[PDB]
Design a protein around this ligand. Structure first.
Ligand SMILES: NC(=O)c1ccc[n+]([C@@H]2O[C@H](COP(=O)([O-])OP(=O)(O)OC[C@H]3O[C@@H](n4cnc5c(N)ncnc54)[C@H](OP(=O)(O)O)[C@@H]3O)[C@@H](O)[C@H]2O)c1
Ligand SMILES: CC(=C\c1ccccc1)/C=C1/SC(=S)N(CC(=O)O)C1=O
Length: 275
């Protein structure tokens, strides 16, 4: 079953595995050809306990949110934690509020639980963007705000310009990609009450031979796959949650079992040393 962790300093616990939705209903453009299959996969994921759903206005050109919108109707809205994101072309005040409105129309819901700046746009003042996001919070359209792909220095800047708390920073983090460690970002999050949300937590399964030999030994000792070990490694870290993409039932099932793996201190030190 699903491991839960506190989001930021909110007093609220969320599933420590999110459901990644990139690819569902298309990538950069809408793909309508598998809509029924995709809605059924989303429903199955949610029923298995994947109630934290990660999406974005860019995903499937808006169509990913539309498919999520159909799938969530089989459940109680308040039981779900839905994350969306505004694309860097839309970070000026009027464009952001329009993006938010359109995201809510596609999801067919009255609010998102978490709304993220998807990527920074250096041309648009952060204070403007964050003030627009606070308008959404004040109106009840957003519960919490956060950011994505912000290094430590830009997260610090956002925190200083934001009326609302920044509850998370969603960045790439996995057994080979250690930019958040080298940047001091993970330490900063852990010391300042910010959740680090690791996307591409399996590195899209593209790993080196050296990494693979270490993971194989640990996996064997736990009767697990190398990917379950990669997830357990992230989830062992304070303030870290992960968003795998699992477009099939086998991977949904496997990744959920990873939340039960208890890595030893020496296993953690060996894994830490692979980057
Ligand atoms: N904020 C951002 O800029 C940003 C950027 C990238 C991604 N994201 C979010 O993070 C999610 C994850 O990103 P990602 O797709 O790059 O990362 P990922 O989870 O590291 O890689 C996904 C790949 O791993 C496979 N997989 C999943 N579980 C597996 C298992 N147990 N065994 C073997 N293979 C497995 C999937 O295959 P199947 O699908 O066939 O199971 C898929 O090909 C995205 O959907 C998105 O929601 C956010
Ligand atoms: C190909 C790499 C991309 S582009 C794109 S949008 N996403 C999802 C995201 O950034 O949230 C990818 O994972």
């Amino acid at each position: 079953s699903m491991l839960y962790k506190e989001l930021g300093r909110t007093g609220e616990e969320i599933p420590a595995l999110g459901l990644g939705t990139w690819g569902i209903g298309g990538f950069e453009t809408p793909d309508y050809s598998r809509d029924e299959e995709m809605v059924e996969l989303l429903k199955t994921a949610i029923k298995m306990g994947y109630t934290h759903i990660d999406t974005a206005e860019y995903y499937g050109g808006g169509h990913t949110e539309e498919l999520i919108g159909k799938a969530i109707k089989d459940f109680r809205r308040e039981d779900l934690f839905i994350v969306s994101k505004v694309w860097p072309t839309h970070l000026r005040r009027d464009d952001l509020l329009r993006s938010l409105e359109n995201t809510l129309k596609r999801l067919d819901t009255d609010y998102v639980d978490l709304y993220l700046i998807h990527w920074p746009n250096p041309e648009i003042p952060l204070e403007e963007t964050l003030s627009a996001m606070a308008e959404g919070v004040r109106q009840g359209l957003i519960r919490y705000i956060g950011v994505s792909n912000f290094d430590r220095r830009l997260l610090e800047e956002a925190i200083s310009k934001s009326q609302e708390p920044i509850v998370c920073d969603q960045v790439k983090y996995n057994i080979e990609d250690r930019d958040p460690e080298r940047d001091g970002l993970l330490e900063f999050c852990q010391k300042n009450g910010v959740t680090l949300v690791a996307y591409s937590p399996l590195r899209r399964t593209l790993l080196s031979e050296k990494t693979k030999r270490t993971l194989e030994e640990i996996a064997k000792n736990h009767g697990a796959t190398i990917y379950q070990i990669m997830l357990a490694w992230l989830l062992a870290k304070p303030n870290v949650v992960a968003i795998p993409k699992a477009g099939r039932v086998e991977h949904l099932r496997e990744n959920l079992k990873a939340t039960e793996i208890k890595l030893s201190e020496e296993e953690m030190k060996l894994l830490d040393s692979l980057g």
